[PDB]
Amino acid sequence: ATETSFIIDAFNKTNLILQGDATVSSNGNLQLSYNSYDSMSRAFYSAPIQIRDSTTGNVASFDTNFTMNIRTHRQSAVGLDFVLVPVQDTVTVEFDTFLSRISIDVNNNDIKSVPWDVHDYDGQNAEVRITYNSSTKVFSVSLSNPSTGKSNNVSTTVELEKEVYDWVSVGFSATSGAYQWSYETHDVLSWSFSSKFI
Amino acid sequence: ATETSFIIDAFNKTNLILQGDATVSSNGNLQLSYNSYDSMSRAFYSAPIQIRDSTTGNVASFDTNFTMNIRTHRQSAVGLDFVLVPVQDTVTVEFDTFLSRISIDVNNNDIKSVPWDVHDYDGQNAEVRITYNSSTKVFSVSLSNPSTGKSNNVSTTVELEKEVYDWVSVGFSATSGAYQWSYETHDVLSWSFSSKFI
Amino acid sequence: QKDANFASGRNSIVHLFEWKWNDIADECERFLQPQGFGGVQISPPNEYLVADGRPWWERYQPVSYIINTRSGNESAFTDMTRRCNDAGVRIYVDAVINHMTGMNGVGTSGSSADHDGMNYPAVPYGSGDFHSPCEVNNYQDADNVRNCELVGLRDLNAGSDYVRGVLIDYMNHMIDLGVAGFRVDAAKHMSPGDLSVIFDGLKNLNTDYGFADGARPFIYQEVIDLGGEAISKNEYTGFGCVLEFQFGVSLGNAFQGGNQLKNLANWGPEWGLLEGLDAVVFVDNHDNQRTGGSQILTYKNPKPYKMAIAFMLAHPYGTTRIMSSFDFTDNDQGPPQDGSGNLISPGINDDNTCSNGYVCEHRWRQVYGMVGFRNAVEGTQVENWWSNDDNQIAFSRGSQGFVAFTNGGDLNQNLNTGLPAGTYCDVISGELSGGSCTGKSVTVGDNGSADISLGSAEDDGVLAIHVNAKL
Amino acid sequence: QKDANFASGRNSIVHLFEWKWNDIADECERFLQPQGFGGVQISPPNEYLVADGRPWWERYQPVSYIINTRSGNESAFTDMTRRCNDAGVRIYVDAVINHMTGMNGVGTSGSSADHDGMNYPAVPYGSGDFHSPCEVNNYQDADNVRNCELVGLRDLNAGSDYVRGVLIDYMNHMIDLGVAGFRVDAAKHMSPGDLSVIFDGLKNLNTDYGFADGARPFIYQEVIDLGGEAISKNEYTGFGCVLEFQFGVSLGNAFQGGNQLKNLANWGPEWGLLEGLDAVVFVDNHDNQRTGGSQILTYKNPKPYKMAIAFMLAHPYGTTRIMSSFDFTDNDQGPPQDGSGNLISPGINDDNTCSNGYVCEHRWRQVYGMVGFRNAVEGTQVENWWSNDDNQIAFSRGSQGFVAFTNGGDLNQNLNTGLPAGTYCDVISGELSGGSCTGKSVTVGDNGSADISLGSAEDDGVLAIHVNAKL
Ligand SMILES: *[C@@H]1O[C@H](CO)[C@@H](O[C@@H]2O[C@H](CO)[C@@H](O)[C@H](O)[C@H]2NC(C)=O)[C@H](O)[C@H]1NC(C)=O
Ligand SMILES: *[C@@H]1O[C@H](CO)[C@@H](O[C@@H]2O[C@H](CO)[C@@H](O)[C@H](O)[C@H]2NC(C)=O)[C@H](O)[C@H]1NC(C)=O
Ligand SMILES: *[C@@H]1O[C@H](CO)[C@@H](O[C@@H]2O[C@H](CO)[C@@H](O)[C@H](O)[C@H]2NC(C)=O)[C@H](O)[C@H]1NC(C)=O
Ligand SMILES: *[C@@H]1O[C@H](CO)[C@@H](O[C@@H]2O[C@H](CO)[C@@H](O)[C@H](O)[C@H]2NC(C)=O)[C@H](O)[C@H]1NC(C)=O
Ligand SMILES: [Ca+2]
Numbered sequence A, B: 001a002t003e004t005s006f007i008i009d010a011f012n013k014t015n016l017i018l019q020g021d022a023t024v025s026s027n028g029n030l031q032l033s034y035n036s037y038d039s040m041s042r043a044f045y046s047a048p049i050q051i052r053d054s055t056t057g058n059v060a061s062f063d064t065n066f067t068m069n070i071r072t073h074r075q076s077a078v079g080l081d082f083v084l085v086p087v088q089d090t091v092t093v094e095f096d097t098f099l100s101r102i103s104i105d106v107n108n109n110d111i112k113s114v115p116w117d118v119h120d121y122d123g124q125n126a127e128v129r130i131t132y133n134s135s136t137k138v139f140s141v142s143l144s145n146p147s148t149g150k151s152n153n154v155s156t157t158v159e160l161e162k163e164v165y166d167w168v169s170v171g172f173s174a175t176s177g178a179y180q181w182s183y184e185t186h187d188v189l190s191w192s193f194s195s196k197f198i
Numbered sequence C, D: 001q002k003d004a005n006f007a008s009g010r011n012s013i014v015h016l017f018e019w020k021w022n023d024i025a026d027e028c029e030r031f032l033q034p035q036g037f038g039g040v041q042i043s044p045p046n047e048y049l050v051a052d053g054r055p056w057w058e059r060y061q062p063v064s065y066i067i068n069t070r071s072g073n074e075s076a077f078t079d080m081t082r083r084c085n086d087a088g089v090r091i092y093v094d095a096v097i098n099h100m101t102g103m104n105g106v107g108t109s110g111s112s113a114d115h116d117g118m119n120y121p122a123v124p125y126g127s128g129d130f131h132s133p134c135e136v137n138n139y140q141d142a143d144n145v146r147n148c149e150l151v152g153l154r155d156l157n158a159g160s161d162y163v164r165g166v167l168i169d170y171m172n173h174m175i176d177l178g179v180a181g182f183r184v185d186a187a188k189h190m191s192p193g194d195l196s197v198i199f200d201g202l203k204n205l206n207t208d209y210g211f212a213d214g215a216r217p218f219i220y221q222e223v224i225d226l227g228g229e230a231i232s233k234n235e236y237t238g239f240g241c242v243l244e245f246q247f248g249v250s251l252g253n254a255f256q257g258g259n260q261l262k263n264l265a266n267w268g269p270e271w272g273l274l275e276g277l278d279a280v281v282f283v284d285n286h287d288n289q290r291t292g293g294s295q296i297l298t299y300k301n302p303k304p305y306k307m308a309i310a311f312m313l314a315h316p317y318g319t320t321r322i323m324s325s326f327d328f329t330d331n332d333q334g335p336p337q338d339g340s341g342n343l344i345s346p347g348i349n350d351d352n353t354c355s356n357g358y359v360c361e362h363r364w365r366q367v368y369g370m371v372g373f374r375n376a377v378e379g380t381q382v383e384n385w386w387s388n389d390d391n392q393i394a395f396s397r398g399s400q401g402f403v404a405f406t407n408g409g410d411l412n413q414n415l416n417t418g419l420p421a422g423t424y425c426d427v428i429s430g431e432l433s434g435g436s437c438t439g440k441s442v443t444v445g446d447n448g449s450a451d452i453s454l455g456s457a458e459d460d461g462v463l464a465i466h467v468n469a470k471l
């Protein structure tokens, strides 16, 4: 099997896949929706990460951090979501700024969601950490604004022992709303991932 | 920048790039030249690894292991080489079974080579370990047959502080000879890599 | 269905974003018509919500179809179609037919709006008339974006006979009043399945306005599709034109400095853009001109923007639409206001600009001069390409016209124009007034081969010349 | 230059690997000719090294050009061209012209060979005549593989006038003796630049053998190119045919069970294979039949192998070459030996096989029966494709012939043949002997539509029928 890992203090298009309005600024930040509305953009690490092993049934416990700075320029439906999208039926932690909910949306059916307020993070840096224990089947998310120390967390039991999942493509999917929810931007400047088997 | 790493106890074509006669058996081993002679095959991890950082000049110290079993079925020119081939001017550690030499061939000019005998490894598993310190500029290779405990090692100072290198594609390049040097095969069943910056 | 419909010998349209009706009329006959203009994409004409602070976006929440807007009631509207249409300026209504409102009750023509209970009496409209509530989750799930509430906005069900009936009545009503087309609002959020049935009840144009007997209504749609999503623009091609959204991004990035102009040689379908005659192209747009850093060019960054719409204009691809926005400093700030009202946009004195908060892009030398350029070259395929294989491009639309430009490198070249030997009054900088050039009086020898000189420091990077500028 | 050259009404060639000259002659007129065969790629005819144990590979280290081999001296050779050529069996010499030897001094015709000092007197040949020493490092460096010593083998310099002179004399000498072509040994290790000049001195064929006046020598080359490498087969296309090496791998993998036969519909250029008339296709080959696990099919695994060469044979692409190897258990074991000598390969009794160590693939029902099939369909494009969208394929070469097969699933179908209504004696299993079928006597109604039945458990997966099998 394949256990993979990486640290990105500064993004570079070279090891990235860009769909829709997804780009990389000279300042080394991944950027989605900066020129679009009512659409969805995405970025994925080149290497297709492996989650389930068919040679044992085993599943990868992945762990991952990433700083991001969501803006709306206004003083999922609209937001930024981390996604485990299979290889060309999607586990997705979504930071929906519009429904104002953080949730683990698996196949359009959120397994657990919790409210959070965008104004507690709009403009500054936010630390997100996703983690999934293969042994206890416990998924967990945490949002926290370092500038103050607010953290909208959440957690749930998710079973990925489904034959259909083996290889996924870890990335980001920032969706953009319409009319006044057209201006939201999505900057991600740090991201680390890590899958593991035993 | 991007520090990358991975452990592959069993290969799978999914996260691999196959050029020439390169494949993957049901037993999970990468295989080159098994159906060819006088030609060169190659396999590379999907993700393009980063060696030099343009934002500081810094260079990645990479470290890496991999078991392999070279056969000739006869009781570089011909052999299996680990290569850091740039992105679509190549540092290459070659296990040439024909000239019977292990060397660090950089731009066709071997920086250091040492003799080794293929019969000390033909048929069984061999542990190779490549390592490059960014701080001391010291490259190093080690071959060792666990079944007995023979190790043909080598080492040299290599400077990769050259603006042209930034992003490479770590892989294997197994070359195959002509006439009686047409039957050599190249099995690789384990491989771990690791780049690092400071 | 995809036919432009302009009064012959004329070319492309304008978005007089938020402008008043009677005002439009003035503009229709005073500036648009004299300049070979196609028409106008008329801002939302039907009764919509009175959202506090009265922002441009309020204009996108239908309270009803009663034709009384902040731009005027029917009287002025009807009038606006009668003056404007006679001038040749075709009117194109923004048809917001996927939802109503997401907030409560204040209709711009006294009609209430009970969001909670899903009631719109002006219509009437009740719960049965709407899709079941749910919201826009994954743009990866096709019926979710179409069948749920885009931004908590009550999603109408264009699948019902009653609802199809009403929308149809609305559009046709407009077709009766004169309009020739409809900038369908958010097609991506509607099943193309009945999007057609609605685009069918529409009876042929009102003969009495000037239209060629039995000519169908131009239908262009809003569908943002820059790949990835489960929805495709092509799904709305078999029955109407779509608004090419990549055009703005790509060509925008190009001139922004994000791409070698040399690459625009194969500008066209080879960039993820549908067949030429399938799109309505545009640079910035009322909505996305709000986004800002990067790719999109708005009047905020003039120079490359003009070269941009110029490349558009000059180039043959799809049908074009310039935009006449109003100055803005927020993202929700409403057009000109005073204790409830839209302030007129006189263009004064006359360098032919505009005042009191309206930018009037269309009245800019560079922009309009190029529109007539477009007219002037019709029926001509792409010919005589050229470049410095970097940021200097040049070519010409047959013996009818020519253009060139540069982001970097004084194009002091010695080129061609492939036109009649003569002289020509550039249109960007200059034009012909009283039989003499007001900017650049260039020469062109006995066989196209002419000399060009466009410097970096200049006001602009572009030079147009065409037989309808020959003195 | 790329023309087959066979005696008309005949098709494709054979590799009688290591067979003796006079023996070839017998085979030429006794079996090859009666069966519509193209010719023979005659094993290396010139003096080469006597490598201990006398392995097939010794045959690839030129000591000299003196025509005395383990297959015979000139007398027998000359004779072999005179009998064999009259029979229509074209001879194709294996031209090893890139190097000499890498080891020392024992020439098969008493000539020495001083490897160390780079001396080959038989010639003569000395250091000046060779490229500078170095070896094959990176197949990524173009001149390195061409200009260095492939496997410590003394690399001749085909760039010199003396060296070009000698090679030219050798080939022409052969052209004088009768041959029509040359299976150039290892073209990838030679600069195409002078590879042409050498392929030019070659004077038109020897009129006195039967050749069409002024016809040039068929030239096909050895170039393994399955991508990645800095060398391409196309570099040797503008002046000669090349041996398609992907053909074996892909089509081999296909039938090995590694790919759906359904995928071979677009079999051809769309698989990384040059223009049809540019290649000499083959399944296994003397060298690569030594590799073993996987992709390559040798007689060691019969069934799918036959279906394979059958698909080849039946299919029109390039020019084909069957291989008649000898049984082997090592990878270096020499053909039949006895204290120095090649033992004859009588085919005996007669089911038309062979004995004492020679496999004689070409004399296999399935293989030869299909060769005549090939002849029988000439000038016919690919027509009437069919499949079970898995491992059952079928089609036919015009009203001239038809074929089908299966790896899995009893093709008990009811198909077409697109031929004259009648009956036909399958060739795989059977043939027509004394006006009656020796295996399958199928019927075909008044318009191609016939019924087929080929079961899994059968001896083979393939059924051929053609007008030259019509009873
Ligand atoms: C990301 O890495 C890429 C690839 O190395 C950088 O692109 C190069 O920039 C260098 C240094 O200026 C140039 O010499 C090359 O011509 C560029 N190559 C390509 C393919 O663009 C890029 O600078 C990096 N981006 C960031 C933000 O560090
Ligand atoms: C993401 O960051 C978390 C939190 O810092 C990491 O978890 C810690 O790693 C630090 C540094 O090695 C340790 O001191 C802590 O013991 C770890 N756990 C906790 C709860 O803080 C984690 O390693 C990171 N994950 C990835 C994939 O980068
Ligand atoms: C490598 O992983 C691949 C992709 O998951 C495996 O291919 C699949 O095998 C599973 C289980 O038999 C099937 O359900 C799928 O249809 C296959 N998918 C594809 C794309 O082939 C493969 O089995 C793995 N190989 C090894 C040696 O473990
Ligand atoms: C390759 O294997 C080597 C040798 O085992 C690894 O180096 C050791 O890692 C082990 C296990 O954590 C430690 O106990 C040792 O201290 C390490 N050093 C030595 C000299 O043994 C190395 O981590 C591996 N590299 C990669 C990229 O997998
Ligand atoms: Ca809808």
Ligand SMILES: [Ca+2]
Pocket (backbone or CB within 6 Å): D098, D131, D145, D146, D147, D148, D155, D156, D189, D190, D191
């Ligand atoms: Ca050579």
Ligand SMILES: [Cl-]
Pocket (backbone or CB within 6 Å): C183, C222, C243, C285, C286
């Ligand atoms: Cl629009």
Ligand SMILES: [Cl-]
Pocket (backbone or CB within 6 Å): D183, D222, D243, D285, D286
């Ligand atoms: Cl061959």
